[PDB]
From a paper:
[name] is an anti-[name] (Acr) protein that inhibits Staphylococcus aureus [name] (SaCas9). The [name] protein, consisting of 170 amino acids, is comprised of two domains: an N-terminal domain (NTD) from residues 1 to 56, which contains a HTH motif resembling a transcriptional repressor, and a C-terminal domain (CTD) from residues 57 to 170. [name], by combining the HTH domain and [name] inhibitory domain within a single protein, exhibits dual functionality as a bi-functional anti-[name] protein capable of both transcriptional repression and [name]-based cleavage inhibition. Our structural and biochemical studies demonstrate that [name] functions as a dimer to simultaneously inhibit both anti-[name] operon transcription and SaCas9-sgRNA DNA recognition.
The bending of dsDNA upon binding to [name] prompted us to investigate whether [name] undergoes conformational changes upon binding promoter DNA. To address this question, we obtained the crystal structure of free [name] at a resolution of 2.34 Å. We find that full-length [name] exists as a dimer, similar to how it binds to DNA. Notably, the NTDs and the CTDs within the dimer share similar structures to what we observed in the DNA-bound and [name]-bound structures, respectively. However, due to the different relative positions of the CTD and NTD structural domains in the two monomers, the structures of the two monomers in the same dimer are different. Structural superposition of the [name] structures in the free and DNA-bound states showed that they have similar structures, suggesting that DNA binding does not induce significant structural rearrangement in [name]. The crystal structure and biochemical assays in solution reveal that the full-length [name] adopts a dimeric form, while its CTD alone remains as a monomer in solution. The main dimer interface is formed by the loop connecting helices 3 and 4 within the HTH domain, which involves multiple hydrogen bonds and hydrophobic interactions. A hydrophobic core is composed of specific amino acids, namely L44, I5, L8, L9, L32, L39, L42, and L50, from both monomers. Additionally, helix α1 contributes to dimer formation, with residue R2 from one monomer establishing hydrogen bonds with the sidechains of N45 and E48 from the opposite monomer.
Numbering used by the authors:
A (entry chain D), B (entry chain B): 0 to 170
The structure:
Amino acid sequence: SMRKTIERLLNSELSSNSIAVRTGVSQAVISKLRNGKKELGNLTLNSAEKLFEYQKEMEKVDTWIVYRGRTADMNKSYIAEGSTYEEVYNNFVDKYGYDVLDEDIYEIQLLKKNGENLDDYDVDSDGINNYDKLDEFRESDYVDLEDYDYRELFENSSSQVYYHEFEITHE
Amino acid sequence: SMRKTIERLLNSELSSNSIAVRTGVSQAVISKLRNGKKELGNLTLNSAEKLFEYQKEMEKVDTWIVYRGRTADMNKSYIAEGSTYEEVYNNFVDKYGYDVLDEDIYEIQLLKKNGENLDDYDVDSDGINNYDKLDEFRESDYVDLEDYDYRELFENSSSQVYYHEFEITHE
C-alpha cells in the first residue's frame, strides 16, 4: 500500500475514530501515526492495505449512466438509469418489462460469450427456435454475462428499440 | 508494496541470505515467511517495500502491458502497450488521440485524487465545464497522477470504450 496515499488519508480532516471505524484499523494506531509516535513504515502490511484501499475509494471517480432508447417510428421513447450497465438493464425491465428488447437477447448474448454457434440454436427474429439445445446448454457449465454484455443487450436489439444512446457522467 | 510481487520473490528459487544482502531484510524474516511462521500481512511496510522494490527492478526489463479496448463496433477495437500503465496511456493517445476516452477523464481523475469537489467544476456528461477553476487548479500546487491512475483512466471510461482488458507479464 503506497505511503503517499496513506499520508493523504492521515492528513485529511477525517477524525481518527472515523478512520478507525471505516477501515478496521485501531484509533490508537491512527493517533500514533498522526502524532509521530508510530512511523508509517512500522504499520503492518494488512493495516497499510486497509488504509490505502479506503483512501483509494475516497478518491475513486464515480460513474452514472443514462440510457435513451427510441423506436424506429420514433413514437415511443425509453429512459433507464444506473451506475452499471446491469443496473440500467434492471431499471429498464422494471419500467418497461422484459418483452421490449429483442427476443432471447440475454440467452443469445450468453451463447455468443461462450463461443457457441447461432446455426445450432436456430436463432431467429422471433427468437431461439431450437429450445432443447438451449436447455442442455444451461445444464452445461458456462461463463456468466459480464457488465459490458448488458450494454450489448440494448445495442444487439433492433426489433422494437432501434436507436440506443448511452450518456455517461463522472460528476 | 504489492503482495503478488513479494510472493513471487519468496516462491521463486533464491537464497534468503542472497535476498538479505540484496534487500537488507533480515534472513530470519524471509525464512519465517517461507515456512509460514510469519504471515506476509504481519510484515512491516518498511520490509515489504524493500522486498517489492527489489523484485520490481529485477522484473523491470521483462515487464510489458498490453491493453485491449472493446467498442460497440466489433470490427473497431483499441490496442495500447507499454512497460507501465502511463506508457500504455501515452501509446493509446499517440495512436488514437485524446477524444476516445471519456470526456476530460484525465483531469477529473486528477481533481478527485487531489480532494477537489467536482460541483465547483460544473462536471457533466460533456466533461468539465468551468474552465476558469480548472486553470486555477493547473496553476495550483497539486499531486500528479500515480501509475495505477492511468489504468483507472481506461477502467472508468464507458462512453466509447466500455470493456477494458490488461495483459501483464508480471516478470
